[PDB]
Design an enzyme around this catalytic site. Sequence first.
Site, PDB file in Angstrom:
ATOM      1  N   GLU A   4       0.790  -1.225   0.000  1.00 42.72           N
ATOM      2  CA  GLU A   4       0.000   0.000   0.000  1.00 42.72           C
ATOM      3  C   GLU A   4       0.836   1.297   0.000  1.00 42.72           C
ATOM      4  O   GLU A   4       0.548   2.223  -0.762  1.00 42.72           O
ATOM      5  CB  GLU A   4      -0.947   0.053   1.200  1.00 42.72           C
ATOM      6  CG  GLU A   4      -2.153  -0.875   1.155  1.00 42.72           C
ATOM      7  CD  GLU A   4      -3.099  -0.629  -0.014  1.00 42.72           C
ATOM      8  OE1 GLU A   4      -2.968   0.399  -0.727  1.00 42.72           O
ATOM      9  OE2 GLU A   4      -4.011  -1.467  -0.210  1.00 42.72           O
ATOM     10  N   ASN A  60      -7.570  10.001  -6.003  1.00 42.11           N
ATOM     11  CA  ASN A  60      -8.316   9.214  -6.979  1.00 42.11           C
ATOM     12  C   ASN A  60      -9.203  10.213  -7.709  1.00 42.11           C
ATOM     13  O   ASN A  60     -10.290  10.543  -7.237  1.00 42.11           O
ATOM     14  CB  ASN A  60      -9.188   8.176  -6.272  1.00 42.11           C
ATOM     15  CG  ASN A  60      -8.375   7.200  -5.451  1.00 42.11           C
ATOM     16  OD1 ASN A  60      -7.613   6.399  -5.991  1.00 42.11           O
ATOM     17  ND2 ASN A  60      -8.504   7.284  -4.137  1.00 42.11           N
ATOM     18  N   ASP A 100     -13.159   9.400  -8.476  1.00 42.36           N
ATOM     19  CA  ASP A 100     -14.261   9.605  -7.552  1.00 42.36           C
ATOM     20  C   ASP A 100     -14.035  10.671  -6.480  1.00 42.36           C
ATOM     21  O   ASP A 100     -14.777  10.727  -5.505  1.00 42.36           O
ATOM     22  CB  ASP A 100     -14.664   8.288  -6.899  1.00 42.36           C
ATOM     23  CG  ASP A 100     -13.809   7.939  -5.699  1.00 42.36           C
ATOM     24  OD1 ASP A 100     -12.598   8.243  -5.700  1.00 42.36           O
ATOM     25  OD2 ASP A 100     -14.366   7.359  -4.744  1.00 42.36           O
ATOM     26  N   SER A 124     -11.847  10.933  -4.038  1.00 42.28           N
ATOM     27  CA  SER A 124     -11.497  10.497  -2.690  1.00 42.28           C
ATOM     28  C   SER A 124      -9.968  10.442  -2.627  1.00 42.28           C
ATOM     29  O   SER A 124      -9.302  10.476  -3.657  1.00 42.28           O
ATOM     30  CB  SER A 124     -12.108   9.116  -2.393  1.00 42.28           C
ATOM     31  OG  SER A 124     -11.494   8.088  -3.172  1.00 42.28           O
ATOM     32  N   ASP A 161      -6.568   8.410  -0.561  1.00 39.65           N
ATOM     33  CA  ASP A 161      -6.089   7.277   0.263  1.00 39.65           C
ATOM     34  C   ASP A 161      -5.017   7.852   1.198  1.00 39.65           C
ATOM     35  O   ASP A 161      -4.064   8.468   0.726  1.00 39.65           O
ATOM     36  CB  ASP A 161      -5.448   6.210  -0.634  1.00 39.65           C
ATOM     37  CG  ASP A 161      -6.412   5.660  -1.662  1.00 39.65           C
ATOM     38  OD1 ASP A 161      -7.569   5.418  -1.308  1.00 39.65           O
ATOM     39  OD2 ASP A 161      -6.014   5.486  -2.814  1.00 39.65           O
ATOM     40  N   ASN A 219      -9.097   4.904   2.619  1.00 36.24           N
ATOM     41  CA  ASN A 219      -9.872   5.830   1.804  1.00 36.24           C
ATOM     42  C   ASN A 219     -10.856   6.761   2.514  1.00 36.24           C
ATOM     43  O   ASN A 219     -11.623   6.352   3.410  1.00 36.24           O
ATOM     44  CB  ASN A 219     -10.559   5.031   0.672  1.00 36.24           C
ATOM     45  CG  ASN A 219     -11.172   5.917  -0.390  1.00 36.24           C
ATOM     46  OD1 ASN A 219     -12.365   6.207  -0.355  1.00 36.24           O
ATOM     47  ND2 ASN A 219     -10.356   6.347  -1.346  1.00 36.24           N
TER      48      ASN A 219
END
Length: 130
Positions: A35, A46, A49, A51, A53, A60
């Site tokens: 990750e 991102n 959408d 959002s 991380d 998220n």
Amino acid sequence: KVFERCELARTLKRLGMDGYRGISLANWMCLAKWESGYNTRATNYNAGDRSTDYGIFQINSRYWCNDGKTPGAVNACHLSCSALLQDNIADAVACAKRVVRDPQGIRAWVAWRNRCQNRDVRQYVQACGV
């Protein structure tokens, strides 16, 4: 902070992650590794959408933490996403535990499915004394 491998294994063990909801320490290590490369300040936008991380587990903003700028998002861990960017991973761990209490468990992260599921993850905790 960028943890060194064994340093993180012991840190996660101290935080009660070993076997949490049946998930071994080696799996959590494999998760953090893929990750973020064990980097607590890692962030990923991102554009699709809107959002972001956050942190060592790349949690998220749509569902887990609040960053105030993710459309129609929720905050299941009831934390500011800022809390997931600290050198001290206690809050990030509490949120990662919250994540796996849901039906999917460790499968919540697609990276775990791609790089850890059905793989030899022993290598992530070897020689760490955990």
